[PDB]
């Protein structure tokens, strides 16, 4: 079996700058290699084969070369509709892909706790949501703290894509419970870390 | 142009056999191999096996050895992927996929749309929504929780409000059913004048929920 | 869950007839995409593990003979035997192979009707080399017999025999559809030697009066 | 040719789980699916789950709360199965069946299946008594007496004489001890020439006993 390694998993650049992408494989190849362009919800496109032809319709900046083991992909100068995720394929095997992301200067979330609702507590559950708003870069770290206690495996967080105009993201973290458990505590905190963040954030509510 | 049409999406149960198909046209189906591809949700593109057109023979990877089958049929021009025995790892889209042509067979110039197959035990239920009271500028929301398929579709004041908004991707818990949240930021002084309603709509079990959010 | 049902759950048929076995099904077996009843019907004959009759609801396995025929479609499917055989004796299941949990329903047993046949009756005194140890067995034979209703009972000096004897009973022949029957009298070393008189008495369909074998010893 | 091997029986005692195997041969072991059904003797059959060889994926039967665990040793296309805490409603024949194929339905194959004794009661090899034929057509036989557990598999002269045989169910008797009976209708001019000799085989107690019947 041949693996092929790509690297960055993510590539952080502006419009206008040259994006280099590489894909390595674990055996000679020669120049069997093909590149591809995907778009959340999308079909893949072709972009290289043979590790070098820009395949049909393909705008001149996308372009690659290389031989035998290392491989590489160019833009010479990104646009708006390159950033995307981007996959090699030799023969049957396929790179775990590359994302290609727009960088800009860093950005701080806005960090809100909402307490369970009420119609949701006579129902014998409780969620705690704590949204991370309009941020940058994309790492964050989110610890739900009950009296100081830190919890594990009762939360689950999700980003969405990087939004279409100041580039930034947003993360929600829903951290579930039973009524009872939730009544037998007071302190529901949500500790964040983030490089916009000199130091660590923690918002909190009582009444549990 | 080349076109690739594949069937839609399914939703089957572990234990069960699920059947796509791809219907070519703009140019001659015996003339070059079939490929298919799947792509579980959050990963890379996985190559699943070829067949021959003209000869009907297959070869598969040998991960899905003993658990798909391809077939054509010529006269309308389609190929079929049925896998048979079905997991939770086979929770993907499919897509069929054609070389450039006999000197370049394996870039794969030509994808049709993609099928998406989920499986699933989960019967079809519709969410549950619950606000997210507020508490310059003021963030609020709407929890909706526990339903199955995953198509959910949030509105604000029946698109009248849709600045700010973040409607997040759904999350799958561990019951088999999705959950996802929907926060927009207002300004405070709005709270005080101006109502907000979350607009739910889950087509599959025909739940359309419409849900205020004010100020605890 | 989806549950099989087969229903009645024995049939009584002479060789030649047809033969109609049911199979419904909660939900459909029917796979839409590419239109196969997931279901299957299995033959277990005695002493042997479920045989793959028919899959795909209609498609029969190698070498199964023309008689059997499978149908239906969605919840209802049935088996069909065109002239049974003797060697078709078995119980038939029906089996849900669309989604987890796989269930099969609950089998019909599909016996042999026969023209009447009396038992040929004989009796076997305990070994000399199982009296050693202090036990004494006394065997009543009761062999290819039809119907399987027969009254066997045990008589010691004239005196009736209740709560000693052990009946077992083949399932009946695969060639001449007959049973076979065999009664035990268990006893002490001791209390055989007592009497002298033993015998079997078999009343079957198939005899004007009952027959009785014995013998003299102990 | 496909072919399924499973042990003939096995004895458990409540407190240790069932441990079966099934040693596989005659086509690719990680090409196809393998279930484990489950048959009390004289009742309807039951699907345990399943598991694909290749990467050991596992699919159970709810009813079983979890007490069971599929697995395979690929280097010998073993298939196992386990039962933990098992009682004496676990005491039944477990097959092992592969499936038809990926395009098929149904399972295609089976095991001869093994016969599991859950109890606390030991083993005991049986005793074979005859049972002497006492002209035109005479009876002759054997009473296998006294054995635990089940079962004992009986032939007459090695397999040659299958003719007019009749090896009856076994019976528990009320000392907790099963027992059975095998017999067969030979021409009694033949009584006088041929010799007749029972083969009982009781695997549990690794006993096998040949017992020359004569008049
Ligand atoms: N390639
Ligand atoms: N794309
Ligand atoms: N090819
Ligand atoms: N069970
Ligand atoms: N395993
Ligand atoms: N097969
Ligand atoms: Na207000």
């Known amino acids: 079996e041949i693996v092929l390694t790509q690297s960055p998993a993510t590539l952080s650049l502006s419009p206008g700058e040259r994006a280099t992408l590489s894909c390595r494989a674990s055996?000679?190849?020669?120049?069997?290699l093909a590149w591809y362009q995907q778009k959340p919800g999308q079909a893949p496109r072709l972009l290289i084969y043979?590790?070098?032809n820009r395949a049909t319709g393909i705008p001149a900046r996308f372009s690659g070369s290389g031989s035998g083991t290392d491989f590489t992909l160019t833009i010479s100068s990104l646009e708006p509709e390159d950033f995307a995720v981007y996959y090699c394929?030799?023969?049957?095997?396929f790179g775990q892909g590359t994302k290609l992301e727009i960088k800009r200067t860093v950005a701080a979330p806005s960090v809100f706790i909402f307490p369970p609702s009420d119609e949701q507590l006579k129902s014998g559950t409780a969620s705690v949501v704590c949204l991370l708003n309009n941020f940058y870069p994309r790492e964050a770290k989110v610890q739900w703290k009950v009296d100081n206690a830190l919890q594990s495996g009762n939360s689950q967080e999700s980003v969405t894509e990087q939004d279409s105009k100041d580039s930034t993201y947003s993360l929600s973290s829903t951290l579930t419970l039973s009524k009872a458990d939730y009544e037998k505590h007071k302190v529901y905190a949500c500790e964040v870390t983030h490089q916009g963040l000199s130091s660590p954030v923690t918002k909190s509510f009582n009444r549990g | 142009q080349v076109q690739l049409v594949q069937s839609g999406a399914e939703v089957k149960k572990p234990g069960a056999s699920v059947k796509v198909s791809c219907k070519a046209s703009?140019?001659?189906?015996?003339?070059?191999?079939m490929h298919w591809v799947r792509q579980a949700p959050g990963q890379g593109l996985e190559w699943m096996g070829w067949?021959?057109?003209?000869?009907?023979?297959?070869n598969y990877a040998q991960k899905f050895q003993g658990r798909v089958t391809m077939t054509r049929d010529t006269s309308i021009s389609t190929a079929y992927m049925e896998l048979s025995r079905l997991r939770s790892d086979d929770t993907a889209v499919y897509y069929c996929?054609?070389?450039?042509?006999?000197?370049?067979?394996?870039?794969?110039?030509?994808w049709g749309q993609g099928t998406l197959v989920t499986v699933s035990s989960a019967s079809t239920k519709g969410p549950s929504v619950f606000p997210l009271a507020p508490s310059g500028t003021a963030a609020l929301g709407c929890l909706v929780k526990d339903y199955f398929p995953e198509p959910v579709t949030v509105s604000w004041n029946s698109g009248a409000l849709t600045s700010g908004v973040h409607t997040f991707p759904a999350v799958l818990q561990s019951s088999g059913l999705y959950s996802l949240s929907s926060v927009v930021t207002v300004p405070s002084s709005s709270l005080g004048t101006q109502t907000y309603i979350c607009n739910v709509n889950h087509k599959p079990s025909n739940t359309k929920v419409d849900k205020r959010v004010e100020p605890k | 869950?989806?549950?099989?049902?087969?229903?009645?759950?024995?049939?009584?048929?002479?060789?030649?007839?047809?033969?109609?076995?049911?199979?419904?099904?909660?939900?459909?077996?029917?796979?839409?995409?590419?239109?196969?009843?997931?279901?299957?019907?299995?033959?277990?004959?005695?002493?042997?593990?479920?045989?793959?009759?028919?899959?795909?609801?209609?498609?029969?396995?190698?070498?199964?003979?023309?008689?059997?025929?499978?149908?239906?479609?969605?919840?209802?499917?049935?088996?069909?035997?065109?002239?049974?055989?003797?060697?078709?004796?078995?119980?038939?299941?029906?089996?849900?192979?669309?989604?987890?949990?796989?269930?099969?329903?609950?089998?019909?047993?599909?016996?042999?009707?026969?023209?009447?046949?009396?038992?040929?009756?004989?009796?076997?005194?305990?070994?000399?080399?199982?009296?050693?140890?202090?036990?004494?067995?006394?065997?009543?034979?009761?062999?290819?017999?039809?119907?399987?209703?027969?009254?066997?009972?045990?008589?010691?000096?004239?005196?009736?025999?209740?709560?000693?004897?052990?009946?077992?009973?083949?399932?009946?022949?695969?060639?001449?559809?007959?049973?076979?029957?065999?009664?035990?009298?268990?006893?002490?070393?001791?209390?055989?030697?007592?009497?002298?008189?033993?015998?079997?008495?078999?009343?079957?369909?198939?005899?004007?009066?009952?027959?009785?074998?014995?013998?003299?010893?102990? | 040719?496909?072919?399924?091997?499973?042990?003939?029986?096995?004895?458990?005692?409540?407190?240790?789980?069932?441990?079966?195997?099934?040693?596989?041969?005659?086509?690719?072991?990680?090409?196809?699916?393998?279930?484990?059904?489950?048959?009390?003797?004289?009742?309807?059959?039951?699907?345990?789950?399943?598991?694909?060889?290749?990467?050991?994926?596992?699919?159970?039967?709810?009813?079983?709360?979890?007490?069971?665990?599929?697995?395979?040793?690929?280097?010998?296309?073993?298939?196992?199965?386990?039962?933990?805490?098992?009682?004496?409603?676990?005491?039944?024949?477990?097959?092992?069946?592969?499936?038809?194929?990926?395009?098929?339905?149904?399972?295609?194959?089976?095991?001869?299946?093994?016969?599991?004794?859950?109890?606390?009661?030991?083993?005991?090899?049986?005793?074979?008594?005859?049972?002497?034929?006492?002209?035109?057509?005479?009876?002759?036989?054997?009473?296998?007496?006294?054995?635990?557990?089940?079962?004992?598999?009986?032939?007459?002269?090695?397999?040659?004489?299958?003719?007019?045989?009749?090896?009856?169910?076994?019976?528990?008797?009320?000392?907790?001890?099963?027992?059975?009976?095998?017999?067969?209708?030979?021409?009694?001019?033949?009584?006088?020439?041929?010799?007749?000799?029972?083969?009982?085989?009781?695997?549990?107690?690794?006993?096998?006993?040949?017992?020359?019947?004569?008049?």
């Open positions: 996929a054609r070389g450039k042509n006999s000197d370049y067979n394996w870039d794969f110039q030509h």
């Open positions: 703009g140019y001659t189906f015996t003339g070059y191999y």
């Open positions: 067949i021959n057109p003209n000869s009907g023979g297959t």
């Open positions: 055996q000679s190849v020669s120049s069997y």
């Open positions: 043979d590790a070098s």
């Open positions: 394929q030799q023969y049957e095997f």
